[PDB]
Design an enzyme around this catalytic site. Structure first.
Site, PDB file in Angstrom:
ATOM      1  N   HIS A 172       5.069   2.699  -2.042  1.00 45.28           N
ATOM      2  CA  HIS A 172       4.560   3.922  -2.736  1.00 45.28           C
ATOM      3  C   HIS A 172       3.588   3.812  -3.922  1.00 45.28           C
ATOM      4  CE1 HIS A 172       7.761   5.998  -0.337  1.00 45.28           C
ATOM      5  NE2 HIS A 172       6.681   6.728  -0.119  1.00 45.28           N
TER       6      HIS A 172
ATOM      7  N   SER B 110       8.340   4.589   5.177  1.00 47.27           N
ATOM      8  CA  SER B 110       8.822   5.677   4.382  1.00 47.27           C
ATOM      9  C   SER B 110       7.690   6.696   4.351  1.00 47.27           C
ATOM     10  CB  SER B 110       9.105   5.105   3.013  1.00 47.27           C
ATOM     11  OG  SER B 110       9.514   6.129   2.132  1.00 47.27           O
TER      12      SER B 110
ATOM     13  N   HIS C  61       1.560  10.310   3.084  1.00 46.82           N
ATOM     14  CA  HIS C  61       1.266   8.903   3.359  1.00 46.82           C
ATOM     15  C   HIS C  61       2.555   8.200   3.743  1.00 46.82           C
ATOM     16  CE1 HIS C  61       3.005   7.625  -0.547  1.00 46.82           C
ATOM     17  NE2 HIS C  61       2.539   8.790  -0.959  1.00 46.82           N
TER      18      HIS C  61
HETATM   19  P1  LIG Z   1      11.052   6.404   1.672  1.00 45.96           P
HETATM   20  O1  LIG Z   1      11.914   6.538   2.869  1.00 45.96           O
HETATM   21  O2  LIG Z   1      11.052   7.758   0.802  1.00 45.96           O
HETATM   22  C1  LIG Z   1      10.578   9.040   1.180  1.00 45.96           C
HETATM   23  C2  LIG Z   1      11.773   9.931   1.450  1.00 45.96           C
HETATM   24  C3  LIG Z   1       9.677   9.606   0.083  1.00 45.96           C
HETATM   25  O3  LIG Z   1      11.606   5.226   0.748  1.00 45.96           O
HETATM   26  C4  LIG Z   1      11.189   4.869  -0.563  1.00 45.96           C
HETATM   27  C5  LIG Z   1      12.351   5.009  -1.541  1.00 45.96           C
HETATM   28  C6  LIG Z   1      10.598   3.453  -0.571  1.00 45.96           C
END
Ligand SMILES: *P(=O)(OC(C)C)OC(C)C
Ligand SMILES: *P(=O)(OC(C)C)OC(C)C
Ligand SMILES: *P(=O)(OC(C)C)OC(C)C
Ligand SMILES: *P(=O)(OC(C)C)OC(C)C
Lengths: 217, 217, 217, 217
Positions: free
Chosen positions: D45, D106, D118
């Protein structure tokens, strides 16, 4: 069967701002050491509740520092069972329970070697910086004390080992009900305290206690 | 010998902000009244400690309000003796002690008339506005409650008088040690509560409690 | 500006079951002490990453025990910033971060006084019981070691104080990028380890480490 | 110079058991495809670390499936050099490293075509079944996926070929230090994860991934 617990902490801080009466000074402490008679350790001054014995009291440049031993299985059980605990390990659960319930010491005085009467474990003491540490090793109980003269450490370790030899094997057994009632009293009498954890935090700082302590403040 | 004490308060507020699960609404309460079976009152959900009985539960526009009776001499002695009190008259001391030690209610639920299981006196409840009042007269116990529908007052007085007639003379006797162990527990499990009196002050406001209450918050 | 950090732990346990090659014995350790040259402390054997200096190595009945000093501000920052931490205090955050990321020591050997080459901080060492402790006081770093000969304690404190006098004021500064790359390497190279915390827990037990440690295992 | 790597996996499974918030359903996905704007791919992220681009997102009967392209030589070097690898051929080493270091996706969401923001490669994602596959061919990257609607395969291949034509030749260059600091962070923030490989094994099963994968779980 009993988990020998060590308590360590300042009985008083020399130029802390204690009210007129409570204040203690170097010369008066000098004249009280060594204590004429052993200093028993009891819970909230209820003299029926003897649970241990003060091993050493050393006059540190900051105030009279002491190290005690608590060998009481009833105190363990009464606490362990009261804790309908949500939130570890074992005797650590015990360390965690006694530290946060009974975080302070309170020295009672009756100048000469008979001045120091006894020490009482309690929630909040009347003199400053009186926050104690509990652990299953003397060294571990004194380690969180960072503002301690090197001599104090070396002297409190020496005296405490000898002292232990005498009351070696002694266990106290005040009575589970006596214990139970005494601890309820510690709570009931401190209910009207507006946030006691502030004081705890504050007096922990005055004592120079630092580290990964069980004390949750 | 027992001093009959009257407890009064909201078992829950209707649109206060209780999390998903705890939330109570008018319809569900409507369906649950009158309770199928009498609601006993105990200390901190330890069912062994029955110390009283809920006389009336009226659905006020604000939430389900109740009035209960506590007739237990052991609770009195256990509390009176724990208080190695420094600091008014007599049963007022008793009022003062229980009010500040167990300031909240907690309604357990098992919709139909068997939903409400019992109410537990406790330090801090999980639902908002659950701060109760204690007094030696029903009228005295409900007076601090200012945001109370006139109908609720006339209704809660009427059922209470009747309800009393049945359990007239009943005195609960859980056993002083059971009491003593339960109350220590109340104290030990709430030791990590940062401040608590804030919550008590906030929730007293929510309930609309105002007056010369013994509640020191 | 740098927070002087003390590391303490066994470099090896004498009859632990280490494979043929890795095993260390009393006589070979006896012959290596005192080390001909100071033992630098680096991160994951990357000899460019010197961050401290081994103060004392004492032959304990259980194995060669050591006490080191890490005075490196870059190591602090690189860790502090990487931790996009959810979950305290201050340098404790630092203690918590270094302990759990770098929980082991690894002694490298080149018998005589030049046998001990250096010690490397790492995630998982190759010899048993090699789990270390980090703290801002030597006494606090050695206290969690309960299975330690009294002589070892008294000797490691004596040597460490003198040793400190020499490198008094020395700070290491390997290079933040060097540091950054070295720590990524510590992670990448240990990714294939199935649950490293089991080993940590296991080797913490073998070392006789106990108490309220920052080590989350 | 960059080795184009293809990532494939489910951004989310439809009826898997994702908590309230994270849950994704067919209608919402229907409305979000095609994405208003291209979906960049970054590491953990940290938006600075754009290393690739999502070519196709097809709504499979099971959940929104995607295929992305990663063309970044810095990521390769940063990973290749961190691995002071003991233990196959070349870009396979690269495959082996990224697969086990960043095994999950993610999807961030800001219903309409601008919902999907994204995708971030990471160690452990918050939604189930989010384990991805990496390979040097799109066909190779989707082959391990056995529970994949035939339409999804033919659709994801078709859009990918087209999508590639646009960003044909594009190579991302976030900056090796940015990469180096981001990856350490990935490592530091997941250090307290008990085991992790279990979850990876479980979620691989959920996704229906089977085959001679580099994923060591
Ligand atoms: P992703 O699965 O998060 C989305 C729900 C925004 O995992 C992150 C915590 C690396
Ligand atoms: P201690 O600190 O009291 C001495 C001054 C006698 O505290 C009591 C009130 C528990
Ligand atoms: P009460 O308010 O709990 C009911 C919701 C069952 O409080 C307890 C935790 C004493
Ligand atoms: P150390 O314990 O290795 C010595 C035996 C040289 O661990 C390394 C692999 C970090």
């Amino acid at each position: 069967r009993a988990v020998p617990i060590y308590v360590a902490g300042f009985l008083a801080l020399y130029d802390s701002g204690d009210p007129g009466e409570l204040a203690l000074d170097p010369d008066t402490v000098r004249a009280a050491l060594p204590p004429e008679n052993p200093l028993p350790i009891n819970v909230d001054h209820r003299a029926r509740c003897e649970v241990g014995r003060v091993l050493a009291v050393v006059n540190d440049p900051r105030g009279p520092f002491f190290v005690g031993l608590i060998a009481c299985v009833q105190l363990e059980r009464v606490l362990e069972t009261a804790a309908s605990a949500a939130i570890l390990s074992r005797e650590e659960r015990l360390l965690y329970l006694i530290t946060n319930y009974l975080p302070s010491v309170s020295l009672s005085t009756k100048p000469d070697r008979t001045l120091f009467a006894h020490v009482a474990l309690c929630a909040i003491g009347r003199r400053l910086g009186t926050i104690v540490t509990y652990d299953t090793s003397l060294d571990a109980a004194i380690a969180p004390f960072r503002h301690l003269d090197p001599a104090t450490r070396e002297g409190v370790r020496r005296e405490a080992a000898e002292a232990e030899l005498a009351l070696a094997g002694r266990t106290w057994a005040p009575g589970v009900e006596a214990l139970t009632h005494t601890l309820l009293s510690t709570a009931v009498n401190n209910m009207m305290l507006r946030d006691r954890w502030s004081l705890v935090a504050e007096r922990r700082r005055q004592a120079g206690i630092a580290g990964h302590t069980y004390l949750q403040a």
